RNA sequence: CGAAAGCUAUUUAGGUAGCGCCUCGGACGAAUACCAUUGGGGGUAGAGCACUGUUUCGGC
RNA sequence: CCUCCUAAAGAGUAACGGAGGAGUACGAAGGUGCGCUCAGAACGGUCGGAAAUCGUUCAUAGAGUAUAAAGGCAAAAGCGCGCUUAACUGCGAGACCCACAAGUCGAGCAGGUACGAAAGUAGGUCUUAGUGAUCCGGUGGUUCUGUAUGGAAGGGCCAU
RNA sequence: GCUGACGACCAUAGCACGAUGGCACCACCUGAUCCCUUCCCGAACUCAGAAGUGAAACAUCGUCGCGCCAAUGGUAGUGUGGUUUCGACCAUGUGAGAGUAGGUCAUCGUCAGCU
């Protein structure tokens, strides 16, 4: 084993995948309960017609089209359902 | 012997060595260069060996470059160990070099001392290369 | 400071603005006070009263009294176009005497909030 | 935290049940909690689980 | 306020002219005076922190508030929040009676006292000083004293320059040099 | 100001019987004696100093 | 007509089970695929030093 | 079990691949109403310094977020204060994820409640770890059953 | 023509520098009785007011110093089909980032007030 440099730097862990991501994209008709992005903060906000739960997803809270946006002083992603 | 003071993670993926220096093909300091041809790995053993052949041969009087600095660890496994139980450790440190870079610059000394000292450098290293000057465009 | 008044009034004219009813804004300087009915969407003015009107421009202004009379006055004008149920929007100003007195002639004056 | 148990003082035998940490809460926990056998909100008292 | 009254009448209108500034709403004003005790034995005795605001509360005739640390620092063994000081800001009538009084009762019974420098000023018009000793306040008495301690007068002025907060605090009569 | 937490403050007539020159302001030292001026008598202090008091050899040979 | 050598779990790992994939029957009937135009979100290839680091030379 | 990367810009995706965390904490560190803004750097100032507390000037966060990392955070989700128990009961349209068993998000409705002048907000905590099926046995409730009948024992249902 | 409120938008809107503005409006400003404030403080908040000033702030105007925006061309990458010396190349479709020329001292809406 001329070296001994097999050096054991024991790491083989990872936990389990989450699926977070975007769900519904713009222009797709949605009912409300439907959930839109799972994702971890607020990577995407609630416009109008989108809530926004403990966990930050956002769902739709009324029926009509999902809309994705750039609003705002922050130029933050919105996510907002238009009746239509 | 170049290597990087610390890092901020002690091994690396293997990675590829794709496409041509278009940053680095330059002579930016010097008066005077020696660029690849090819691509490959720089070893930090290669970068001093050269470097020394440079300086022997230029004799205090000029001022030398070097261009590449060898910032990727390579990792290597010991002589009768199988195959997997983890990543082996590091034991030497490369540059990656596309064809374009210049490795070497030269500058306050006569162009044939230049030349000379860069064909020296050149013959110390694992690359196809050629001696450039410095253009303005 | 104006820039700090308006960095704590942003949470409330949010909300109200989620909630997409007709707003109430106040805005009281120490010599006028107006008041003035925002559509859900927040760009239109429908109702307004203030102490530059003719009736109270020339009287006691900055005053309790006129912050009062300010409110009676935009209820009834709330009242003639149309509006009943509005969210009162102290716009950073302390709910408390002259944006209360108003508030509280507003209320009593018909609008309902 | 140990767990202990909050009971209706309705004497309805409802409870809630929950943890605390008997070092920095050594007396005995009450809150007003609502009680459904008697659709009404009155103390609860802690007990042993 | 007496001073308060001299400044509105005649120390403003001087001060304007001494300084060559065109409108009446340039000329610097004090705009507070702050005391501070910070004790930094605190936090290890628990006496000297309410000896010094007791001796606070007798100076400057407001209750002080207990400042407290904002970070934690081995080397003088302080944790967050742990009370390290004393603090007072004086405004108003209540400003200008405690300068009046530091001016004209105290600074002349400093020991030792040869004048205020000037360049103590901060840079923006505001000045700092140092009184060692605070027994030279009339209000705390000898007889009945806990130890000796200090404290440190700001005077945070209108000036936005140090001539002008020097001219001001000419205008009061301060001891400077 | 709030109400029943400051200390006492009201009205003190410094005097600095040195050059004879008096102060009258607001502190909180509790005088002995209560001298009178021109308006009424304030608790009275004596001053030993104030602001208005407080400031080769071989021929001799 | 026509797979699979996958996922999940398992005293499991060359066994077994659900799902996936094959077949047969029924229901249903374009809800499917390809392409054109079009509405989306992205952080990869490339690139770059604005952050985290790392590197060289000069000035200071 | 959680976080990052490998992971090829939707999801997922292996290795005895590369790196780190968890098996808790909190009756306030939860709810609400109101209010606030950090780290640093320089200048001035008693002890007092590189750095304590005080004042000033710049300072979109170079801070903080109970804790790892990532993502987020000004309407702050960060920091205070008053009152509080929504860390509620019955549920839940609709979705996400998923072999199953599980897991996740959820407007709205009813009842009771807290805070707010109010429109309102609140079914724990910035989120993602802090976990363990069934059997068996214990405990608090319950009229459901009750081996001739009335009971009871035992069983069931709800909570633990 | 200007001021204020609320928005759209979120740097071609910003920063910096300079200039103009007090009849309205706005801001400083005066006082702290009263309502209400301060773990101290009328600083902030709050009230009652107009002796003063546009000094600060704010608003408006000007400019390219910074910032920001940004081509055209080229290059890199790349889907499909082919070839390869494994670097790439060809056909076809697509096409950056950086950099350069250049641009920018915003543009709109509702309502009220003075002229």
Not at chain 3, 67 to 93: N, P, W, Y
Request: charged share 30%; with cysteine.
């Amino acid at each position: 084993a001329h070296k001994k440099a097999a050096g054991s730097s024991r790491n083989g862990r990872d936990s389990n995948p989450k699926m977070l991501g975007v769900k519904i994209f713009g222009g797709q008709a949605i009912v409300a309960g439907n959930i839109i992005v799972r994702q971890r903060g607020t990577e995407f906000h609630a416009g109008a017609g989108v809530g926004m739960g403990r966990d930050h997803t956002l769902f739709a809270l009324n029926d009509g089209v999902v809309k994705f946006a750039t609003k705002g002083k922050f130029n933050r992603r919105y996510v907002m359902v238009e009746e239509a | 012997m170049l290597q990087p003071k610390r890092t901020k993670f002690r091994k690396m993926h293997k990675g590829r060595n794709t496409g041509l220096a278009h940053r680095g093909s330059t002579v930016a300091f010097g008066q005077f260069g020696l660029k690849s041809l090819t691509r490959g790995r720089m070893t930090a053993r290669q970068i001093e060996a050269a470097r020394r052949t440079i300086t022997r041969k230029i004799k205090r009087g000029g001022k030398i470059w070097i261009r590449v600095f060898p910032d990727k660890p390579i990792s290597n496994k010991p002589l009768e160990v199988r195959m997997g139980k983890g990543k082996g450790p590091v034991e030497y440190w490369v540059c990656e070099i596309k064809p374009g870079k210049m490795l070497y610059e030269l500058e306050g000394i006569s162009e044939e001392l230049a030349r000379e000292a860069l064909t020296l450098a050149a013959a110390k290293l694992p690359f196809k290369t050629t001696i450039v000057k410095r253009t303005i465009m | 400071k104006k820039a700090a008044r308006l960095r704590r009034a942003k949470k409330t004219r949010a909300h109200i603005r989620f909630l997409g009813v007709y707003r109430l804004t106040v805005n009281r300087t120490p010599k006028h006070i107006y008041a003035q009915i925002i559509s859900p969407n927040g760009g239109e003015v429908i109702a307004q009263a203030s102490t530059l009107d003719g009736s109270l421009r020339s009287g006691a202004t900055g005053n309790a009294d006129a912050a009062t009379s300010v409110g009676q006055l935009i209820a009834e004008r709330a009242k003639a176009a149309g509006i009943t149920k509005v969210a009162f929007d102290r716009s950073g100003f302390k709910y408390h005497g002259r944006v209360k007195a108003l508030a509280e002639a507003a209320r009593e004056n018909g609008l309902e909030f | 935290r140990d767990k202990i148990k909050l009971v209706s003082t309705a004497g309805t035998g409802y409870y809630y049940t929950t943890t605390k940490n008997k070092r920095t809460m050594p007396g005995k926990m009450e809150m007003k909690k609502f009680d459904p056998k008697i659709r009404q909100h009155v103390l609860f008292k802690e007990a042993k689980i | 306020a007496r001073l308060k009254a001299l400044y509105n009448n005649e120390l403003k209108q001087k001060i304007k002219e001494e300084l060559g500034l065109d409108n009446v709403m340039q000329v610097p004003k004090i705009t507070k005076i702050t005391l501070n005790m910070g004790v930094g034995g605190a936090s290890q005795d628990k006496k000297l922190l309410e000896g010094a605001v007791a001796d606070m509360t007798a100076i400057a005739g407001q209750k002080p508030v207990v400042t407290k640390a904002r970070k934690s620092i081995a080397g003088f063994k302080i944790r967050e929040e742990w009370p390290i000081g004393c603090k007072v800001t004086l405004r108003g009538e209540q400003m200008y009676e405690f300068l009046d009084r530091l001016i004209a009762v105290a600074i002349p019974r400093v020991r030792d006292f040869r004048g205020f420098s000037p360049k103590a000023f901060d840079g923006r018009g505001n000045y700092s000083l140092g009184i060692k000793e605070q027994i030279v306040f009339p209000e705390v008495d000898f007889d009945k004293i806990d130890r000796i301690r200090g404290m440190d007068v700001t005077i945070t002025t209108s000036a936005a320059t140090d001539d002008e907060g020097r001219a001001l605090l000419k205008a009061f009569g301060f001891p400077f040099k | 100001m709030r109400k029943d937490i400051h200390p006492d403050y009201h009205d003190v007539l410094f005097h600095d019987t040195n050059a004879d020159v008096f102060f009258l302001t607001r502190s909180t030292v509790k005088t002995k004696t209560t001298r009178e001026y021109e308006g009424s008598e304030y608790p009275y202090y004596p001053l030993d100093i104030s602001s208005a008091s407080h400031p080769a050899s071989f021929n001799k040979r």
